[PDB]
Every structure is written in C-alpha cells, then in structure tokens.
Design a binder for these strands. Structure first.
Lengths: 129, 123, 150, 80, 205, 80
RNA sequence: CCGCAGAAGAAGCACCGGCUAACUCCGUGCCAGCAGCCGCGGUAAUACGGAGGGUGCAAGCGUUAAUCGGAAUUACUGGGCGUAAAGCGCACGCAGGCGGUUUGUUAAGUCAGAUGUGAAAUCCCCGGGCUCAACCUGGGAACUGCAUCUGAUACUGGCAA
RNA sequence: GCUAGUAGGUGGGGUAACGGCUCACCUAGGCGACGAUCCCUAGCUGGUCUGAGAGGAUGACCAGCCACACUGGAACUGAGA
C-alpha cells in the first residue's frame, strides 16, 4: 500500500538517471502530472507522456546532460508525515540562488519563483535544484 | 526519530548536572577545617600533596586543596574556598585560596601572587 | 599559477621490526588564484621535503571549481567521510570565517568572501574532504544554464 | 459566529448535560507539526436529542450551571 | 590604558614600518627596526592561523591607537551599516577624529594629533571637541582653534605632515586649518592596510 | 476617568518628560493608557521638543480626562 | 567656561611546554611544587621557584561560581541504531499516526487580502539630544503571535458518488 | 487509578452578577495515559541573556499582573480591601 505516491516519482528519477534508462515508469495521479510539468518547463525532465487509457502511468522522459546526470539536489522538502505549508513571505528559497522548488499553492501548481509574487505561498512539494 | 514519537516522549537537551558540584552554588565558601593531612596522590605522579578536609559552615564535609608554601592551618581554622579542582587527587573537588580571611598568604612570593593571594611588595 | 600555502603537518609511523619510523607526512595547497587547486601527502622521513613532495603531488592533482567574485554561488551540504561540510553564501562582509582546513583551500582558489561551517569530526586530514564537497560539487550560473540550453 | 464547534458526543448518562468531545489542530513549534488534541467539554442541553457518537453543532454562550458555557444548537446527524 | 607605551617597539615586533614616533629624518637611521625585539626577536616562527590573526590585528590596531573594547564597539557599528563590513570596519577606524585631523595634515603624527584632541586645540564647528572616538559627519567643519594656532606645537605639526600622499576623501587646508570630511574612506583609500580579512576572522569569534 | 500627565523617563541631569494618558490611581512611570506625545525642556530649537496630538486629547477631554498644571499650560505654550 | 604654575599628581595584572599569541638564565632535582585540560618534575627544567626578556588585556586584570554557545553533545531546524552506545526474542492488534485513485462538494487545515488585536519599555531601521560614546530620545518597522471577517480551491482533512 | 457538594438534574437561598458559591431533594455519574490525581520544584509575563537562527537557560533593576503584610484567622467599612 503506498504512503507516499510522490516519492515513487522522485525515487525513480534519481535511481533512473543512475541506471541510465531514458524514461522510467511509475503510477500517475493528477497532482503528479502537474509536478512533472514544472520540471519539464524549467527543464528537469526531458518530456512526459501519460498512458491512462488502460491503467495510468506517468512515462516521464529523462533528460541527461551529456553523460553526467542532472540530479544533485533532488529531495522532498515535505512529507505526508510532516505536511507543511510556508506562507508568501516565509517561503525559503532552496539550494543555491539558482534553486528551483516545485511549490503548490491555492492557484495551481507552480514554483518558488512564480508562486512568490503570484500573490501566494503554499506547499513546497519538493525541489530539484 | 519520527516526530509523532517525540510528540509523546519529548527529547532531552541536558540532565542538569555539573562536572564538578560546588555544594553551596556560589563563588566562595566559608569552611572550617577538620584535619591538616598531607596524603600521597592518586595516579602515580609520586609527590607529597598538601590536602585537608574542611567541614563547611552550611554543611557538607568536603576536602580542599592547600597550595603555595607554608601553612598556618589548624584543626579549627576557618578558610576561604577558591572552588574548583585538580586531577590526581580524588575526593578533592575544592581548593582553598590563601591570603584571604584570617589566613595568611604565601611566604616569599614575588610573581603570580594573585594565584595564592598575597600583596605585591612595596617594590 | 602559484600561491604557496601549507595546511596540516604531523607524523605517522611504521614499526620496522622493533625500531620505528616517524615519517612526517602532511597536507598543503598551492593556489592558482582562480581554482584548479589540489592537495598532496608528502611523505618524508625528515621534516622539510615533507611539503616539498606535497606540492609536487599537488601539481599531479586539481579540482576545478567555477566561481566568481570570491563568493561561491552554491551552498554546500555535501558529506563524504564523517566530516559534514557546509558553506552558506555570504555576499559581503565575511572573510572566510574558518579555522578548519577548509579555511585555506577556500581562499587559494580565489575566494575572498565566503562564510563557512563544518560539523563532524575535526580530523584535518579529511577536513580536506571539502574538496569533493564544495569544489567538485558545485553549481555555476552557466551550469544550470545549459540545462535550460535544452 | 457564535464560536461554533462541530463536535461529537461521547456521553448521554445525564439529562441536560452531554459531554461533547472536540479538537483543534495543535502545533508544536519544536516538533514543527500539527496533531489532534482532543478536549472533552461540558455542555448544557435542552434535554437529550441524540445518542452517543452523535455529530452535533454546539456554540458558546452564558454559563448557567457548574462548568457550562456552551449549548447545543442542533444535532447534525447520528452517523456520517 | 591609552597605550602610549614604547611606540615603535611594536613596529619592531612585526617587522613592518610605521610613522608613529619616528621622524622624516630617522627612518631607522640612528634607530633600529626588527633587529631583535627581545633576545629571541632575530629568529622567526612559522605561526598557527591564530598566530597570523593576532599579529596582523595589532598591525591595524596601533596606526589608529585603538583598544580592544573600542574595536568591538566599531565591529557592531560596522555590522549596523548596510555595506561590506570589512570596509565599514576599517572605515570607522579612519573615522576616529584623531586620524582625520592627522590626514588633513594638522597632526605631526597619528598619535601627536590625539595629544591635540586632549587639550581644546581641536573643534568641529563653533563646538569644542576633546573625544577622539567621535565619528565625524559627512561634510564636517573640523577646524583648529584660534588660540591654538599660536602654539609652537601646532605650527610644527603641519611641518612633519608635509610631503605625504594625504588619501583624499577630505580637504587639506592652510588658510583656516578647517577641513571637510567630504566623502567617506573607501577600499581605494586604503594604502595597502587591506587586512580587513584578518581582524573580521578574529572578531567573529 | 483618565488623567493626562508628565512622566520623566530621561537619564540623569537631563529631564525627558512624556505626556501620557494614564489614570491617577497608578504610578507616574508605571501604568499608562496611551501617549499623547512628549515634552522635552531641553529643546531650544535644534530639535523639536514636543509632539502635539491636539486631536486625540480633544476627544479624551470629553471622555472625562483631567489635565495637570503642566500639561494644560503646555498646550498653551504652543497655543493652537 | 576662564585663568594659574608646572610633567607636574595619576599603571598594573595575568600568562609565555602544547592546545594558544608570547624564551632565556640560574635555584631545586618524581623532592619542592605546578595544574583549565593533555600532563610536568627523579640535575643544560622553553611547563616548577626566583630573575631577565617578551605577549595579550588595561584602571582594571585574574581566579572562581553560574548561564548560553561552541556541542548537529540527545538532532523540529539538525543524528544514529549489521559489528562502535543503540531494533522490544517474535507475532497479532485497540487506541494513536499515516492513507492508492476518479468525479463532485465543503472549506475545517491551508494560502491570500480585510479587520481587530499583538501595552509601553526592551529589541530593530533610519534620524536627533547630551563636548563624543555609553546613555537618553523621535518616527517607522518588528511586535515570529492570536482571533474574526472576506476571498481562493491545487494539496491536506470531512462527506457523497 | 482518582473523585461525595463528587458530577449532573431539579427547585430554595445567597453574591455586584453567572455558578453546588451555599442549601433541600433526586439521578449515579464525573475526571483520567490526548496524563487526571498525587509528589518535588518555582512567583508568572512582557521580556532578559546567550545564540547565526531555531532553540535553550533565565525572570535582578524597568513595566504589567497575582499573591503576601510578625504567624495564623476573621469579618466591618466603603464605589472598591
């Protein structure tokens, strides 16, 4: 039985870079789709395709650099077991001044950056950079 | 580990206990004197070390270090305690500052006087 | 490409069959003033050539870091050995703020304004393991930028 | 608002007094997360109109007998 | 104390030259630097990190005349200006009234200038000033007294200043010996006293 | 009943009063309602030694405030 | 604030084996004694005692007690638990904690704004007043909060399907 | 494990007012490991100190609150003890 769906994503991303696949599999869900979206825009994953028509899986395409991976900061800020929310002006910027955290808010799923002056704060789900 | 365990069973931070107790909780102590002995030290470091017990006036029977050279100490002498300890002597957790109260300082000391009280000479 | 320094310095021993050697081995660093700076273990049975030989093996090493304006842009979190290594970015008003091995290696690589920390064992021989953990682990403006190049 | 707490009964062994049990999410700033801290309270009731395990609405109000200062406004449901 | 102890001897114990009690006639001619302060002052030790930080601190510390306690007060004022507090720190040491007056050529030396500040010789505006820990304000009026230019000390104290660089953040005057603190000291107005790295290490402990 | 009054909190050999609304049944430097500015007699026009709040007081006086010799006459030193 | 002679009346304390900045010489010789810790000392003592010299602080310095830090050294931030301290001997399971996924709803959690409220002082930012600073002080911010009001619906929780 | 004015319901009385505050009767509950009750310790807070923060320790002077006034106890007066 799963306790974190979201881990299933992140775990297999870092693993999978390491494993030298080019796209990895794990069960989708609505939120998960929308997390893979910010990564993708910002560039953190190559692209993504969702086969739901039979049984949902988020087939997310791995981006590589050249041979070196692009994972170095992947960790989940939040947990199911430590659900967290950080306000508009008490949201930390993560790792580096170049950092990127996927952050959910009341509008949508966004990012540290975007979410900020978007008048919002909310759950920082994770970060990749 | 996990938070919810701690929510029940809070983490400690200290136990609130000194390395060296003071047994009066202050800078300085009035203690009497019970026996002017000179024992040989704990650990082999072969010497004669001037110690003395001393019944403090607020209670507690404790043992204090005697330093410098010379003495004036008596079995009903009443001393000012420096506090703090030295290694190589076991039941000593306490030290006597001479040259304070009735007790005299070091006879013929002309450097590092503050340690073991004694006034600077006129010169 | 030079800017001589030494760091640590100490002795080590093997038991010959009953006699003992007491070889003086040690860490150094030679700068370049922009990074590409290493480390060496200069064994010497005597004391002077103990840093001689170290500065040799320094030339036989390098770890390139990219950094600008004396301030490494990327905080350090990295852990190798039981030495935890840290560096929080400080734009200004901090020197090096260090008494570690990680004082000297974070200066010679051109580094005039950083603020630093470590937890773990104080053991200077692997305080130099900040070199995996801040030199080779780095994140540069152009580094992330070529993720975005894609 | 009349300080309205959606609570759940846990005691009809008296008439006009029903012990309702409610919680707020209490946070520790040192365990750094919310938890359920449930606090029984002593409400003053019209007679009885509920069983136990009865989800209800209660409100603050005057005191009017020992440890009373909440009232029943209505019984939401017996079971959800 | 205020120090005011055996001056130059510290220049000896650091091996680095300073005008503090020297002339412009004696530059270690008929005086000596570093030959051996003490009977062990000839031979040089390598020094631990803390070694460097202590020595170097004392370098900066003695060409303003500044004490420990004083220096901490400066450190919490530095880190209480928004700026680079390396700069802010050494800016405030060259904010001491005794120093700006010397650096406008009215003191023979850094130290002798403060002998002036003792007496009622120095002033800012019409206001008399005897305190040297006074951080002068942007655009000041830091004049000598009327009845202090008549003294033979003050005439002879424009003399020894002559022929120095006089790092400009301020005006150097001889009609009314009245300057202006017209911008602050800066990183460029250091004259190779760039040792801001050391003391900010020392202090942060 | 509130009582507007002075209250010196300034360092030795240098009065710095503080015109405050308190009540007369409590300490001069103690318990206060809210301020209504300051009075410094050491001002001589290199800084302003007062803060008026004319408006605030004008409401307070109707609310049953009482004015002491100093405070009353100090509105007078600045008139309107 | 003015005048008055005349350097006049105004420097010490601790430490210097290593940690830790700062060495020599004698006296003594596991004796004397030192001692925050590691440890010194049994005859050229860089560690004792005295002296010479020096180093750092300074009208205070040192010593002690005591708090916090350093110490991520009991770890929310910020830990381990195969052998170093450290997985109940092993299962089941109530309470408690946690909850796959889809639609809808609610908006309690949560986010936002709104409104009260968070005393003053203390604190903090800029800026004044005491010859300067200490101190005192003005306005503003903070006042980590709390509640309510009105909004938001991605997640979290509740209900339904 | 604890709790008989103990916990609640009726109806009197009392208090400036609500209230076992107190009283008569009636019910047999109420409270507790989400830590009651009991024991040790301690004035409590703003805050203070330290600290990078988070946190910890602490609560002297300055401010607010509570209690206490030789020890114990009690009421009277009065707007208020």
């Amino acid at each position: 039985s799963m306790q974190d769906p979201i881990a299933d994503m992140l775990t297999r991303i870092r693993n999978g870079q390491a494993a030298n696949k080019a796209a990895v599999t794990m069960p989708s869900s609505k939120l998960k789709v929308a997390i893979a979206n910010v990564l993708k825009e910002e560039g953190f994953i190559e692209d993504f395709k969702v086969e739901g028509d039979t049984k949902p899986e988020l087939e997310l395409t791995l981006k590589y650099f050249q041979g070196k991976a692009v994972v170095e900061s992947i960790q989940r800020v939040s947990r199911p077991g430590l659900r967290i929310y950080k306000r508009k002006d008490e949201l930390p910027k993560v790792m580096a001044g170049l950092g990127i955290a996927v952050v959910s808010t009341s509008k949508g799923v966004m990012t540290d950056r975007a979410a900020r002056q978007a008048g919002l704060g909310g759950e920082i789900i994770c970060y990749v950079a | 580990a996990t938070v919810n365990q701690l929510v029940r069973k809070p983490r400690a931070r200290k136990v609130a206990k000194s390395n060296v107790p003071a047994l009066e909780a202050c800078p300085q102590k009035r203690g009497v004197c019970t026996r002017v002995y000179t024992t040989t030290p704990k650990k082999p470091n072969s010497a004669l070390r001037k110690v003395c017990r001393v019944r403090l006036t607020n209670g507690f029977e404790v043992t204090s270090y005697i330093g410098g050279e010379g003495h004036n100490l008596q079995e009903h002498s009443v001393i000012l305690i420096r506090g703090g300890r030295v290694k190589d002597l076991p039941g000593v957790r306490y030290h006597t500052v001479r040259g304070a109260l009735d007790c005299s300082g070091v006879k013929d000391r002309k450097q590092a006087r503050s340690k073991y009280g004694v006034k600077r000479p006129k010169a | 490409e030079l800017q001589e320094k030494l760091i640590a310095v100490n002795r080590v021993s093997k038991t010959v069959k009953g006699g003992r050697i007491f070889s003086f081995t040690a860490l150094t660093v030679v700068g370049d003033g922009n990074g590409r700076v290493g480390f060496g273990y200069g064994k010497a049975r005597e004391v002077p050539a103990a840093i001689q030989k170290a500065m040799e093996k320094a030339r036989r090493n390098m770890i390139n870091v990219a950094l600008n304006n004396g301030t490494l842009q990327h905080p350090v979190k990295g852990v190798h050995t039981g030495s935890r290594v840290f560096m929080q970015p400080a734009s200004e008003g901090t020197g090096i703020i260090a008494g570690g091995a990680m004082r000297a290696v974070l200066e010679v690589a051109g580094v005039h304004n950083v603020l630093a920390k470590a937890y773990g064992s104080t053991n200077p021989i692997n305080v130099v393991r900040a070199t995996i953990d801040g030199l080779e682990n780095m994140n540069s403006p152009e580094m992330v930028a070529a993720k975005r190049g894609k | 608002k009349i300080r309205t707490l959606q609570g759940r009964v846990v005691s009809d062994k008296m008439e006009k007094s029903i012990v309702v049990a409610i919680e707020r999410f209490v946070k520790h700033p040192i365990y750094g997360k919310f938890i359920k801290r449930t606090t029984k309270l002593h409400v003053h009731d019209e007679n009885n109109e509920c069983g136990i395990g009865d989800v209800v609405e209660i409100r603050e109000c005057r005191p009017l007998s020992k440890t009373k200062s909440w009232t029943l406004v209505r019984v939401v449901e017996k079971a959800v | 104390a205020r120090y005011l102890g055996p001056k130059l001897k510290l220049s000896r114990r650091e091996g680095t030259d300073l005008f503090l009690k020297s002339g412009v006639r004696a530059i270690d001619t008929k005086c000596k630097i570093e030959q051996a302060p003490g009977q062990h002052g000839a031979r040089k030790p390598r020094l631990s990190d803390y070694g460097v930080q202590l020595r170097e601190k004392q370098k900066v510390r003695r060409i303003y005349g500044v004490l420990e306690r004083q220096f901490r007060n400066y450190y919490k004022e530095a880190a209480r200006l928004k700026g680079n507090t390396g700069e802010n720190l050494l800016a405030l040491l060259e904010g001491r009234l005794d120093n700006v007056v010397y650096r406008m050529g009215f003191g023979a030396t850094r130290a002798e200038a403060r002998q002036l500040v003792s007496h009622k010789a120095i002033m800012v505006n019409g206001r008399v000033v005897n305190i040297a820990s006074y951080q002068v304000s942007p655009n000041d009026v830091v004049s000598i007294r009327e009845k202090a230019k008549k003294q033979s000390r003050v005439k002879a104290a424009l003399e020894l200043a002559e022929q120095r660089e006089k790092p400009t953040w301020l005006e150097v005057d001889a009609g009314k010996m009245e300057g202006t603190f017209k911008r602050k000291p800066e990183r460029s107005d250091l004259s190779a006293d760039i040792n801001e790295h050391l003391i900010v290490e020392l202090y942060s402990k | 009943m509130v009582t507007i009054r002075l209250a010196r909190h300034g360092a030795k050999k240098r009065p710095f009063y503080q015109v405050v609304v308190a009540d007369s049944r409590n300490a001069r430097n103690g318990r206060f309602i809210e301020r209504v500015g300051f009075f410094n007699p050491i001002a001589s026009e290199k800084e302003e030694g007062t803060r008026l709040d004319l408006d605030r007081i004008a409401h307070w006086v109707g609310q049953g405030a009482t004015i002491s010799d100093r405070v009353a006459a100090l509105i007078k030193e600045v008139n309107k």
